[PDB]
Ligand binder design. Structure first.
Ligand code: HEM
Ligand code: HEM
Ligand SMILES: [Cl-]
Ligand SMILES: [Cl-]
Ligand code: NA
Ligand code: NA
Lengths: 713, 713
């Protein structure tokens, strides 16, 4: 079937905005996973998981009699797709069980691990999501083997279709760098938003960079990819050495014996893949990565033997049975157990990337400290494991169940508890009135609240207006946020806040986070009044103010909007057209195409644009809430041409006279060009639409204001 | 950006089942277009449309001062994509305004026509859909030019994204036959379900078949394509000669002057395309098809001049200014007006396909009759125009407004009015009890009601259980319907109906159509009781019984299921895998993926399979309504292998013993293979799911039973 994507491969793709519809969801409209989980007997699940670790199935027999290593690998890969640059990937949606992740080469034989979990999934049904179960299983594996974890939170609801993620442009699995779709340029600079060195890997190549087995150069790739997954040097060392305390790799024979990945396998495979023709195809004969390394003398028990071996031996380069580069301690005795034959023992082996921990100078210092102080190693690993597996779960308010750690961690962007009565409706009306009486304009109000609320991204549920981090470094100095205008608004709102709070009885006070939002609501209400319409914008108090000391400035950098079509803002020049970056931002904001369309056209006429640019301001009543953007954008009396100065700026002129009416960017004019977006613009630009426009604008404005309010979930 | 389709181009595509979600729809959940239209002042709209016809806009100046030709073409293109094989295409969704139809080469410059209608669309907003407006505008054009139409019905709700239709496999627009993706094979046999001779055409090539200007061989293509669009010879001659009474073609210069189609055009084109560098690029200089023909002496007025010219001259082959083959009248005077210069006149011209109407023997007889009896021509053209533009609208119950023709037409598959009191709840309970007492089995009951209801297709809203057409030719004889078993069920139900009806007072009676569905409900109820569950299946009376004379047997043939996965039925061998045909049927039934999943797994255990096949009957309690299909399908204790005899049949054996447990087809096993369908199967196969399965099964069963119930809409 030839499709639209075939005829018009560069048209904008809206389908990413209508994924996750109620149509694809098997659960009822009212199903609430947190309610279900909260009644799960979690202790019972963990007991069944503990029994499972040592109950070998003949179709994928357990190494050493214990599946714990396999399950730790499964849970680390579930979490290990995460990229800080956009928040996408991670364990939070259980996406390892969908394409393409289920079939990535680095996820080979994790289809077996997931299948081992079906009996338990089936037993507990909807009360434990696959997403939660993958992580819980890795915790239970660690615990069964003697390792004390830092805790566990439930609350990852299942999803029902693949997410749309840019994983790279390569068309070949595992393509080495330098090809026609290379993700590298310059001096080994990996393109944003990617966080892996090759298509279909989690982070790095275990043999070394593009297969070159140099521990020192491998360490460069480790550091860069782990940083792109939000982990620093100490977390990276602790995670790699911790994970490789357990289990083993699989490379018993040549990789050519391994068949089709799950998405390519025959229907009789029933969702499994990588069927191998090497001997029995499993167990002693397993082939997964092609490497054949067992790190420690007790692969089913927590120990400090990884570092004992790494530092205690001198290493030499060798080849696995599948021909991959790996390292062996030739002076060692045969002290490592065989996974299936109690009469065999093996010498210590390591991957190139394990030796990175010793031969990179900065990693060596850390590894040495963990070697000498294994209690420090255990604590670091427990903390990093928790971070790894929860990094995309959002605010602590989403965390469910009896094992949530009480310690509040800086990475969580924590929000202080609220310990005082909240403003009520009358108080909100009084504050709206004071804000409007202060002289702050509709534009200032709308822009400030937008700036605060629109850092949210649903990919990892970071950002949003809770915390009032807009007043802190680095958000207060972001170019998009108009730092000097922003400072003047915040000073005025802070004086209003101080006056109101000082006049109260009995502990009632308003947060600046809440007042910034409410003030935005007042601006929207005044804009509707300017247009002749009385509306009330809904407002939910309860946000709290975070301190600068509770705010990791470097972690906050990835939230900076460098492209924000809702404010007609582009920080620099990008390869990707601005309209594509608008849809990407809409997706992060969890907006449908209709919601994107209404929100943009209202923001334009409210004066939300950065720098007060006239681009897309297609109204002669700026700061009134009307459908003017749509009516003027769709007026065929106006003809549009790119300017000589800038091909991405357009002049709209009267078709009969030539007089200049408007200017616009690609983001403005896409609404008049794309056949689906123009059909939406039409609805809002019709003569019957004034009420609908205002209603829908208020609804989406309020949705954006509440994106991080999991305390009301 | 590499996607799943790139890695796994053959994996089954479910996205077609989640199109048209509430996410992509700008209107509220509760918007009811029928109610909006019913309040529209249709007469006011028609007045504005009449004024438009001669209000020429300088960006696309009106030929002869009158847009009527352009608009008739527009409306006939809107309706002209329709295929009887699947009911897809047609005017009923307003898909002309979306990709790919907006950019088909045969729809060149209809972007201009649609833009001329924006001011009227805008004025009346949601109360007139684009879909309705395109057809209305064609009617008004006819009326403005002196032709009285047969009528008009509103009610075509707008859609908000492209439909997924198979339009062919060619990768080149207008590719001639015999290429790598040829839609032809054999003795010019066009592949089902296609109804056009080339990719991007409505029906045929106006120069002739593959560009060869032979009117006789063009006639063969016209007859075949028009038959695939539900039109016979008389309707075809009436439509072509009727349409070509008006207007003109556009080919003033070489086609290389025309640039990008709308989906490929720059953003500044604002939704238009085909911009031409030939002289002014419009009006007297327009280029659309490349042909330059004006048919009649009065192109803006209804006349009998088409047939006067066709028969009154001999025709000579010639070339347009763009190089296309066309015909000119030998020896004629310059009697045809120029569209823009009152001092110029031109000789009569014709397309190859117009000369088909004279040189094909069967068409010549009809054309001669219309030539001698122009009142017969006018009435046939009115009737065919109405059919053309309403053929995909469904039952008469959907038709809205004050211009709906009262005459009931055979093509509408008409249902007689109900003129008597309906059965009530007590009576329904009495009939269900009589059905269960008769000895009919759960399997017979469920199979019969499935067979009757599952002929519905949402593409053209034909089919369904209303009418009791299952008892008439040809449905009673369809292989899928198990004609001999069907006849024994219908005999028993007809005896029950006669006895019930005979015992009533006061005119109350039950139709056989209702009893077939009620009886299916009884079977589902009994199945639930067999499983130990108390269930009540909803039932809405009011279907009536159609007669054989109200049932066009040839038109009914395209509704025959040759593949019905829900009955594990495949009539023969097809190129397309059975699972792909299952998703196609689910799409015609308007089902989501979850609904398709639950319905199939219930049907399997209820005994709905054709021929009582054991394929997919994964239960030891056949005719009990349980989730057994899912629990047994997902049992990893069972291993699946294709049989030696047939690669599309599989054996499921106990993995440890080798004993045979089950057999299944691809339709059955795709639910344990495809990663999205497997995730749905898992929900229904969990230990907490028996009640959800029953409740979701009853809901989808009832949905299918009511698909054609537009009298309750
Ligand atoms: C530089 C980072 C990493 C590299 C290149 C890497 C590479 C690999 C490879 C190639 C295997 C063998 C796959 C097989 O053949 O079965 C694997 C196994 C494993 N990895 Fe990693 N790893 C990395 C980091 C991690 C981390 C962060 C963890 C967990 C905290 C993890 C835990 C494990 C475990 C437990 C296994 C054993 C699997 C089994 O027993 O079946 N690794 N690693
Ligand atoms: C064999 C079937 C048909 C063929 C091959 C065909 C071919 C064409 C072509 C090539 C044009 C010229 C496009 C352009 O250059 O502007 C056209 C114009 C037109 N056709 Fe057809 N036609 C067919 C049937 C129909 C039917 C069924 C109708 C309506 C009932 C129709 C009504 C018109 C009208 C009104 C125009 C004039 C457009 C204008 O004035 O701008 N034709 N036809
Ligand atoms: Cl994701
Ligand atoms: Cl369609
Ligand atoms: Na994420
Ligand atoms: Na259709």
């Amino acid at each position: 079937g030839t499709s639209n994507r075939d005829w018009w491969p560069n048209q904008l793709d809206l389908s990413i905005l209508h994924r996750h519809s109620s149509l694809s969801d098997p659960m009822g409209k009212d199903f609430n996973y947190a309610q279900a989980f909260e009644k799960l007997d979690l202790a019972a699940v963990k007991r069944d998981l503990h029994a499972l670790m040592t109950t070998s199935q003949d179709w994928w027999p357990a190494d050493f009699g214990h599946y714990g290593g396999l399950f730790i690998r499964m849970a680390w890969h579930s979490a290990g797709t995460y990229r800080t640059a956009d928040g996408r990937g991670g364990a939070g949606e259980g996406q390892q069980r969908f394409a393409p992740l289920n079939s990535w080469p680095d996820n080979a034989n994790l289809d077996k691990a997931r299948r081992l979990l079906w009996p338990i999934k089936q037993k507990y049904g909807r009360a434990i999501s696959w997403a939660d179960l993958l992580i819980l299983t890795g915790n239970v594996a660690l615990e069964s083997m003697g390792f004390k974890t830092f805790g566990f939170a439930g609350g990852r609801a299942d999803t029902w279709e693949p997410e749309d993620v840019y994983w790279g442009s390569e068309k070949i699995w595992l393509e080495l760098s330098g090809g026609p779709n290379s993700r590298y340029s310059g001096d080994r600079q990996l393109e944003n938003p990617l966080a892996a060195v090759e298509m279909g890997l989690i982070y790095v190549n275990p043999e070394g960079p593009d297969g070159n087995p140099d521990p020192v150069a491998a360490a460069r790739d480790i550091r860069d990819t782990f940083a792109r997954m939000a982990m620093n040097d100490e977390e990276t060392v602790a995670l790699i050495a911790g994970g490789h305390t357990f289990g083993k790799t699989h490379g018993a024979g040549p990789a050519s014996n391994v068949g089709a990945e799950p998405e390519a396998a025959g229907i009789e495979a029933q969702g499994l893949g990588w069927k191998s023709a090497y001997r029995t195809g499993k167990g002693a004969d397993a082939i997964t990565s092609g490497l054949e390394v067992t790190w420690t003398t007790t692969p089913t028990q927590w120990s400090h033997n990884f570092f004992e071996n790494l530092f205690g031996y001198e290493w030499e380069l060798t080849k696995s049975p599948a021909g991959a580069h790996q390292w062996v301690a030739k002076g060692a005795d045969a002290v490592i157990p065989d996974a299936f034959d109690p009469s065999k023992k093996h010498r210590p082996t390591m991957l190139t990337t394990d030796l990175s921990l010793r031969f990179d100078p900065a990693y060596e210092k850390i590894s040495r400290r963990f070697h000498e102080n294994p209690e420090q190693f255990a604590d670091a690993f427990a903390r990093a494991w928790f971070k790894l597996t929860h990094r995309d779960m959002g605010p602590r308010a989403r965390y469910l169940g009896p094992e949530v750690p009480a310690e509040v961690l800086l990475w969580q962007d924590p929000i202080p508890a609220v310990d005082h009565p909240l403003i009520d409706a009358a108080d909100a009306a009084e504050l709206k009135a004071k804000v409007l009486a202060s002289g702050l304009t509709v534009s200032q109000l709308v822009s400030t609240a937008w700036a605060a609320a629109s850092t949210f991204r649903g990919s990892d549920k970071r950002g949003g207006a809770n915390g009032a981090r807009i007043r802190l470094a680095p958000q207060k100095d972001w170019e998009a946020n108009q730092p000097e205008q922003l400072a003047a608004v915040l000073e005025t709102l802070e004086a209003i806040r101080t006056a109101f709070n000082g006049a109260q009885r009995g502990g009632k006070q308003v947060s600046l986070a809440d007042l910034i939002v409410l003030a935005g609501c007042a601006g929207v209400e005044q804009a509707a009044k300017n247009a002749g319409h009385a509306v009330t914008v809904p407002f939910a108090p309860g946000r709290a103010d975070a301190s600068q000391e509770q705010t990791d400035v470097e972690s906050m950098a990835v939230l900076e909007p460098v492209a924000d079509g809702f404010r007609n803002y582009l920080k620099g020049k990008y390869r990707v057209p601005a309209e594509v970056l608008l849809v990407d931002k809409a997706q992060l904001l969890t907006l449908s195409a209709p919601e994107m369309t209404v929100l943009l056209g209202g923001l334009r006429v409210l004066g939300a644009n950065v720098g007060q640019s006239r681009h897309g301001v297609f109204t002669a009543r700026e700061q009134a809430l009307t459908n003017d953007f749509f009516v003027n954008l769709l007026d065929m009396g106006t003809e549009w041409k790119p300017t000589a100065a800038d091909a991405d700026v357009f002049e709209g002129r009267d078709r009969a006279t030539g007089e200049l009416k408007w200017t616009g960017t690609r983001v403005d004019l896409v609404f008049g060009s794309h056949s689906q977006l123009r059909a939406l613009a039409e609805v809002y630009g019709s003569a019957d639409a004034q009420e609908k426009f205002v209603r829908d604008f208020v609804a989406v404005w309020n949705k954006v204001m509440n994106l991080d309010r999991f305390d009301l979930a």
